[PDB]
Amino acid sequence: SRLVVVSNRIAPGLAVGILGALKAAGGLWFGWSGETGNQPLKKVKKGNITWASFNLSEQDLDEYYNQFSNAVLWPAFHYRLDLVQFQRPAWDGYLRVNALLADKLLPLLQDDDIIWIHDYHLLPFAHELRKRGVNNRIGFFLHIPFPTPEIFNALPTYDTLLEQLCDYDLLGFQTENDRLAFLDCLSNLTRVTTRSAKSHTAWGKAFRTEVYPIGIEPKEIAKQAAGPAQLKAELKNVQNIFSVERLDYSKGLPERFLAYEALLEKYPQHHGKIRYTQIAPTSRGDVQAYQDIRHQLENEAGRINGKYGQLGWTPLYYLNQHFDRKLLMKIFRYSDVGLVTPLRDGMNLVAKEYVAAQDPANPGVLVLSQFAGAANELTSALIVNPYDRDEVAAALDRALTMSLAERISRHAEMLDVIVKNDINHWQECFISDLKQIVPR
Amino acid sequence: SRLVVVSNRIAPPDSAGGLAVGILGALKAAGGLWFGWSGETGNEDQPLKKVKKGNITWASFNLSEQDLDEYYNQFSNAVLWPAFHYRLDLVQFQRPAWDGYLRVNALLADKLLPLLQDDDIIWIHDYHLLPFAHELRKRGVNNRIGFFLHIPFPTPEIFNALPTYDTLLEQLCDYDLLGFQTENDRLAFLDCLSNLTRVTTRSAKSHTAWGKAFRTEVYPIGIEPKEIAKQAAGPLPPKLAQLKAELKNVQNIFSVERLDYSKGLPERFLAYEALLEKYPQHHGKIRYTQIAPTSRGDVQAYQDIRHQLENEAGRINGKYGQLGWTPLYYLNQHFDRKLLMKIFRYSDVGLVTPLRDGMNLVAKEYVAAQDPANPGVLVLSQFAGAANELTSALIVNPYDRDEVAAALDRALTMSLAERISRHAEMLDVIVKNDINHWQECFISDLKQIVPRSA
């Protein structure tokens, strides 16, 4: 029937896949406005689709969003226990708004609707709804990694989370290892029955699990990359190594600066002839662990440039700013090397967008972290372990001097994979699998 | 007859710092024996290293790792330097560093002794050696001994906070002559001395304290201006010559100094950030290059300021940078003086804004290096000793970042006629108070004093 999409924020990107499914049918996109202060539920309609937003109180945002989502789940799911900041009033807050959002979404549902829930903010949502009587087919997709038991079981509230996740009919993950980790955690807590492959029972409750590796829109990226500057006419001499991501400790930005320093240290042949540009807009800047990383990068930029810089050559361009998506695609195109080395990442679309944006007759080289979800598919990238800075240095030198013949063959294999598994292929696979599920 | 010069830091016969440059030029006018530290550590016991290069004889010694620690890193650089630059919060006084300082002053006095002739005139340089005359008098040398302090002398409220302030004052009175950079320095000394004891002053400049007689005077250090013009007019190294024809659209703001907290580098960066924020017309059209070689890197205060400076470079470029334009170039590196002079010449603006500075040679070098037919603009802190002389500079208070930014904007848009006017007046002063003139006045005043006798 109608498709109901629930996510932390709505867009009146992840957008194209969600908007895509919800267009092939229509329905509702329900989510928080992204603003605060106190009100009746706001709606905007455009054909078969409606957008539904709502505000949050200051205290509710703090406990649920700033604290539990961003200071407990985010760090823990990225294998950063040292960074989790669990307090009880935050866990209560996270339950309270999940419940509240079940209330608000109640007068809008219809008995044959399908329901698609997105991401770590809404883990207890299936539970809140089923408590309020809903029996519709409910699917969940987790965009970030799912951690092994040894990490997950450290959450003081891990057993509740596991119980509630089982109130979904379908659980979708970015990779196979995420799927197994979730099943591993459950198995530690309770007995699980695998009737047949990817169909399960625990505490009597029934549910299915599957891997849906999220992708991009290859044709669209190609268009904006090829679009219509003086800097380019000036730099036919300098090869550009380029990185872009949110300023987040999962991304391993300081380890990246250290690998670049290592390149400059052990490969003097490149002095004056290469540049590294890192774009990193501020994200979640009111959490302490984020401010920590931000000051580190300021210091590291100042230090590396001060050491290796010359009167007419600045080795490192660090820009703490947001750039528009279309512009970035063009930058990908003229960049000789794409540096994507996160410490832990659900997928990382940046790595996919980089390959999609390349001129296929003269493509740049992708250097990719083994811990990004994308490493499972993009096997023709230069795969690296970011904890070995000298290996990342070695790979960067390898990428800078790679013959056009090898550049083309790696790039084509990777573009092949990205084409087959589009954003549209992603969203169709989820919705189809969700439909085959028999409701209770 | 013979001039004996003593300083900690020497210029090597064949490092950033104004003392060694000043003395080197001073001795090229004079001739003499230059006694001082080689710069190396270890083999403290090896004989004096004697090198002859024209009319200058060098004699150098090594220091032990431990002598370096106490005399240099602890007391000179962590007690005297911060205090004399009005940074009492940075002073790390403990009694063993003081004892260390006196011990090596005495050790050095023993080493000089056998090289002294009876009619030698002795010129001691700078804060490392305040107790030197006193060690010499104790070993019966009755020669003319002059002292020149290259840094400011702080007012009584600051100076008197030094636990050891009274001994320092007592020992300074063992010199026959004391020279200072500015009248304010000379007056501060006399003020401090007056609090401790009755000083009898005749004229303005002639004194007795504890029955010791001595003279004070102001000798603002200068440069060798024609020589700077020649080294500045030379061609750039082939690499940088090629680069120079790319900075034709961009105006250059240039600064150079040791990475020292006296130099106000963080505040200067904040002034530039203010230029960027309040004068957006300059975006993509200017560049500020800061050359800041590490100085005294084993002292905590110096490590702290370096970390502050690094953060600010990263932050300001992170905030105001663009894909094809980096506003600020920070270089934690030493550059050859001759290269620096050429860089001064092609810069449009010299930014010289220390919080406290004994004189600041860089500000004078900057004006001497300019092409008189197309000169850049000096922006100068009122707290540099040189601001007493370089009156036609753009004088600013680096505590007011907006006033520094306004001066930057004014310097960047200044007409050719105003630039020449300003440059000529400053260059006139610099030519009249030559390094030759400095040396000449000091030595001549010293030769006018009759030696004490037994």
Ligand SMILES: O=P(O)(O)OC[C@H]1C[C@H](N[C@H]2C=C(CO)[C@@H](O)[C@H](O)[C@H]2O)[C@H](O)[C@@H](O)[C@@H]1O
């Ligand atoms: O809203 P933000 O700016 O604080 O963070 C941006 C998104 C980061 C996160 N992006 C994930 C999505 C994707 C796309 O499926 C993966 O490529 C990333 O590795 C993974 O980090 C998160 O899942 C979203 O809910 C966030 O809104």
Ligand SMILES: O=P(O)(O)OC[C@H]1C[C@H](N[C@H]2C=C(CO)[C@@H](O)[C@H](O)[C@H]2O)[C@H](O)[C@@H](O)[C@@H]1O
């Ligand atoms: O020898 P360092 O490396 O510990 O420091 C360099 C010099 C900085 C200092 N130069 C001063 C000299 C001069 C000119 O002689 C003034 O221009 C400066 O304002 C003043 O800071 C210090 O006084 C000297 O003894 C030092 O050798």
Ligand SMILES: O=c1ccn([C@@H]2O[C@H](COP(=O)(O)OP(=O)(O)O)[C@@H](O)[C@H]2O)c(=O)[nH]1
């Ligand atoms: O300044 C920026 C930085 C990044 N992005 C986009 O943000 C998305 C980040 O997604 P990714 O999966 O790579 O990382 P995430 O932020 O979700 O962890 C990418 O599509 C980028 O194109 C952007 O539009 N402007």
Ligand SMILES: O=c1ccn([C@@H]2O[C@H](COP(=O)(O)OP(=O)(O)O)[C@@H](O)[C@H]2O)c(=O)[nH]1
């Ligand atoms: O990389 C550098 C930095 C500085 N200097 C020189 O070091 C001296 C600095 O003297 P100044 O009086 O400005 O300050 P100081 O360092 O003594 O406090 C000047 O002669 C500069 O030309 C240099 O030759 N190379």
